[PDB]
Design a protein around this nucleic acid. Structure first.
Ligand SMILES: Nc1ncnc2c1ncn2[C@H]1C[C@H](O)[C@@H](COP(=O)(O)OP(=O)(O)OP(=O)(O)O)O1
Ligand SMILES: [Ca+2]
Ligand SMILES: [Ca+2]
Ligand SMILES: [Ca+2]
Ligand SMILES: [Ca+2]
Ligand SMILES: [Ca+2]
Length: 901
DNA sequence: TCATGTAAGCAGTCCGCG
DNA sequence: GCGGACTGCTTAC
């Protein structure tokens, strides 16, 4: 097999590399890597190395990496550019793996671990590590085993061995319900003292040294705790055995309001799953407790135990250990679904970076571009200092707030990357500038044509047309990967809808789910077999289809994020290719493109309808337009349609056969106007929206920019079994809105769009009457909690104290003098409830850590004093009033003449 | 919240507005 | 009481 790296590090003048050799074995080597850098040279000096602008360079080979870094410093002192890859391990990888890396995940040791620490005096701080580690569960992907290290004897209690037999049993048998599928994979090791536990753990770690290390909050808790505990007990040298090269660094992570400390383990790639989830999931959750996320992702119940976690080991050690094991497994289950480890390996090996660098699009693109240029013997420019400067972004149309009955949307494929490719925007393709007219002059095609030689953006920039820039070349490759995975995702989505349709008529039989590839549209034969299947088999197929769709989503949306990140990186001062001329060239072209096509679409539809100056495009944001289809439907007449699917088909055909060709014509004209390199503005129909045929539903409404709701029947070629609400920006979509209120507002919207005013009024009246019965957590608002200390003046709110911070201060006074009470953590999320006048907490609100029940001491008082009236007005009535006013509807029935009867 | 970008919405504070 | 200046937070793209 072809060799591939696992990890790479620079340690002084040595590269330390762990890798898989040509025989599939894990090896480690130390290489005295001699790096090269470059200086500009005279044209008279023969060279094969050129900078990205075509200027010749001489290669300077250094005796060692320290000599190279010192030379960079002297070049700065002289005032001359030091060219080339200054991150020497990236240069090392580029030299050692000069080919497309084909990796074998089965040879990569991925470790998932979690530790338990009993602490009677509050949260066990990793920097202090003053409490015994009393459990470790460490799953190894190569062995496919859960290694459980269990401390039986502690200063906080001596306990009996954990029983795998009790662990396997149902909760109703007094067991822990450790999943049957992992029972045989547990290797259980009890210890009579912590020192022997940790020594054996370190010997185990040496034998099975993680390449990828993950788990939940491992970077902020488990790793620093283990390192510091071992350091406290045995000394520094023993703790450094967590590094395969015996090197570690206490790294300071700095944010906007303070800093924290993590441990860098050289020769390991730490991918904390919480960080993977936050970057790659495209959710924003009210809580990031593993219990909350597992419930959301997997629909598994909360891990239930009695009393505080600080007493769980002594009261129920059996459950304590079982829950530690289950916690490790839940992360594996989440990854089986989301496939973020797979994604990270894919992206890391593609770029030729340390795997943990996938968190940084700037590092990722620096490496991709470096490797691309190196292939052509080209030499990358030195990174420079730049001041942070604001620059303009996208255009968003101000919509007229209203109901909109029939709506068809259109969207540009991968807009910013397509602009880069179309215009040929790159550091080395800049050709010059032209005199800019106001943007509206280009939008309306009255400005002088910018250039008859170069490819242009309406910000004034011109680009070469003779050859593709490196940025267009490399962005195209990732775009093409993204396109492939999106195809799989949408096929799985369409396949899911076939199964949902079939589930209306399930067969009374005992059978099995079909062995099919959900990434490809079901054949006619498969469709015929599905129509004969039982509900049990259909539901299992639906689950598998939906899991295939999730895998495709992960692969596609994050490749989209990477390419959109390149466009953004051009406007970040730390990017080697930072250039506000290129950043603005993209965004300004986008503004023109959207408004140009708005004009073209309006012109086209006014022509086909025989009107003048009427606005068909009701809204647009960045790269999408929303077109009113009322007149198109009315031109045939609603009574002519058999059912909802009939007018959906009609609009689908109209958009494809009439509108898309007109849109294409309009964009081809724009491409010629700007003299662009290649026409890549591909705007396709996105959504078809409207009320059910014959109903009193309103179909859709807008309240303002980035705030709308649509009843969608078909999305990007997926014809839904049941209509789906597309809601953007409204309170139903915000993590700050109480869970039960999101639910109620969604139903209000569903009723407005699908059923009408009377239906909405019925539901409102019921919700208002019954809502006080809702569980307090379900009606609590949520907020991130920053700068608690800044607004704290002797335990009371200082000037301009935010409402949620006021709540935290109230909580802190209520729990004061109790080391055991859950503390609110700076920068994390809190639940927030309003409090009625004259409550014993002495303020108008209270807040506590999100994802948790409020502590028993004050729970009863919170429940008694919760201000239901305020909660309802703020989270429910105020937003509903916004929706209904925009839609010209009433959520409460107005008085009429019929009342007199 | 260490980690690519901008536009823009709503909650809430403070305070003007005769 | 609503709106502007401002902070804080959160989405849409
Ligand atoms: N996270 C982001 N970072 C930077 N720019 C972004 C981000 N999201 C969106 N944009 C910008 C660049 C996009 O090309 C443009 C339009 O976004 P959007 O319509 O979501 O997707 P897209 O057009 O890039 O891809 P798609 O092919 O899925 O439509 O907005
Ligand atoms: Ca735990
Ligand atoms: Ca798009
Ligand atoms: Ca699309
Ligand atoms: Ca059937
Ligand atoms: Ca869009």
């Amino acid at each position: 097999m072809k060799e591939f790296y696992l990890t790479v590090e620079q340690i002084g003048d040595s590269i330390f590399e762990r890798y898989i050799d040509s025989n599939g074995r894990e090896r480690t080597r130390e290489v005295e890597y001699k790096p090269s850098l470059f200086a500009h040279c005279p044209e008279s000096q023969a060279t094969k190395y050129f900078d990205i602008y075509g200027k010749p360079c001489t290669r300077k080979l250094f005796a060692n990496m320290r000599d190279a870094s010192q030379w960079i410093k002297r070049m700065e002192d002289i005032g001359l550019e030091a060219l080339g890859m200054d991150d020497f391990k990236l240069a090392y990888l580029s030299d050692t793996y000069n080919y497309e890396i084909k990796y074998d995940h089965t040879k990569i040791r991925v470790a998932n671990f979690d530790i338990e620490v009993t602490s009677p005096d509050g949260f066990p701080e990793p920097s202090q590590a003053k409490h015994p580690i009393d459990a470790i569960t460490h799953y190894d992907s190569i062995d496919d085993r859960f290694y459980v290290f269990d401390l039986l004897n502690s200063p906080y209690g001596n306990v009996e061995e954990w029983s795998i037999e009790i662990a396997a049993k149902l909760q109703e048998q007094g067991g822990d319900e450790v999943p049957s599928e992992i029972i045989d994979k547990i290797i259980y090791m009890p210890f009579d003292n912590e020192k022997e536990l940790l020594m054996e753990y370190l010997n185990f770690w040496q034998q099975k040294t993680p390449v990828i290390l993950t788990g939940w909050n491992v970077e902020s808790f488990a790793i620093p705790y283990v390192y510091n505990r071992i350091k406290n007990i045995f000394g520094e040298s023993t703790a450094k055995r967590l590094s395969p090269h015996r090197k570690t660094r206490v790294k300071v992570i700095e944010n906007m309001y303070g800093s924290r400390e993590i441990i860098t383990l050289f020769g390991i790639s730490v991918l904390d799953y919480i960080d993977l989830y936050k970057k790659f999931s495209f959710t924003n959750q009210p809580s990031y407790s593993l219990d909350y996320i597992s419930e959301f992702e997997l629909n598994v119940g909360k891990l239930k135990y009695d009393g505080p976690i600080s007493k769980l080991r002594e009261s129920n050690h059996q459950r304590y250990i079982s829950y530690n094991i289950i916690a490790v497994y839940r992360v594996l289950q989440i990854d089986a679904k989301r496939q973020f480890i797979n994604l990270s390996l894919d992206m890391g090996y593609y770029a030729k970076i340390q795997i943990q660098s996938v968190f940084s699009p700037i590092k990722t693109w620096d490496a991709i571009i470096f490797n691309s240029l190196k292939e052509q013997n080209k030499v990358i420019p030195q990174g420079r200092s730049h001041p942070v400067q604001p620059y303009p972004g996208a255009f968003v149309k101000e919509p007229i707030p209203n109901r909109y009955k029939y709506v068809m949307s259109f969207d540009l494929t991968s807009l910013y990357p397509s602009i880069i490719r179309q215009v040929n925007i790159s550091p080395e393709t800049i050709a010059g500038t032209f005199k800019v007219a106001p943007l509206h002059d280009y939008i309306n095609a009255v400005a002088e044509r910018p250039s008859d030689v170069y490819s242009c953006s309406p910000n004034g920039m011109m680009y070469y047309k003779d050859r593709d820039g490196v940025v267009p070349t490399e962005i195209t490759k990732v775009f093409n990967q993204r396109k492939e995975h999106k195809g799989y995702m949408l096929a799985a989505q369409r396949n899911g809808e076939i199964i949902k349709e079939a589930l209306h008529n399930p067969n009374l039989s005992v059978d099995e789910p079909l062995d099919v590839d959900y990434r490809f549209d079901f054949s006619d034969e498969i469709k015929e077999k599905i129509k004969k299947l039982s509900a049990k088999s259909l539901n299992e197929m639906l689950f598998r289809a939906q899991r295939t769709e999730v895998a495709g989503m992960t692969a596609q949306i994050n490749r989209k994020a990477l390419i959109n990140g390149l466009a953004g990186a051009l406007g970040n001062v730390w990017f080697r290719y930072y250039d506000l001329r290129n950043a603005t060239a993209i965004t300004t072209f986008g503004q023109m493109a959207l408004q140009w096509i708005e004009r073209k679409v309006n012109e086209y539809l006014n022509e086909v309808c025989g009107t003048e100056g009427e606005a068909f495009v009701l809204y647009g944001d960045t790269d999408s337009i929303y077109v009113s289809a009322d007149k198109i439907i009315d031109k045939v007449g609603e009574s002519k349609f058999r059912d909802t699917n009939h007018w959906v088909d009609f609009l689908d055909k109209f958009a494809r056969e009439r509108m898309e060709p007109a849109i294409d014509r309009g964009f081809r004209e724009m491409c010629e106007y700007m003299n662009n390199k290649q026409h890549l503005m591909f705007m396709d129909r996105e959504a078809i929206a409207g009320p059910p045929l014959g109903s009193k539903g309103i179909g859709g409404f807008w309240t303002g920019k980035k705030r709308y709701a649509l009843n969608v029947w078909d999305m990007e070629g997926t014809r839904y079994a049941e209509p789906k609400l597309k809601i953007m920006g409204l309170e139903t979509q915000k993590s700050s809105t109480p869970k039960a209120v999101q639910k109620a507002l969604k139903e209000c919207i569903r009723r407005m769009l699908q059923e009408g005013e009377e239906s909405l009024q019925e539901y409102f009246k019921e919700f208002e009457k019954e809502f006080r019965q809702l569980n307090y957590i379900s009606i609590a608002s949520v907020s991130s909690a920053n700068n608690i200390a800044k607004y704290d003046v002797g335990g009371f709110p200082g000037p301009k104290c935010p409402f949620h911070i006021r709540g935290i201060l109230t909580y802190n006074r209520a729990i004061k003098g109790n080391i055991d009470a859950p503390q609110v953590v700076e920068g994390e999320k809190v639940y927030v409830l309003p409090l009625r006048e004259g409550n014993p907490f002495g303020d108008k609100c209270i807040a506590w850590p999100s994802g948790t029940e409020i502590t028993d001491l004050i729970k009863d008082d919170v429940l008694h004093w919760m201000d239901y009236t305020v909660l309802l007005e703020k989270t429910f009535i105020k937003p509903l009033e916004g929706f209904t006013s925009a839609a010209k509807l009433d959520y409460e029935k107005k008085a009429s003449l019929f009342d007199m009867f």
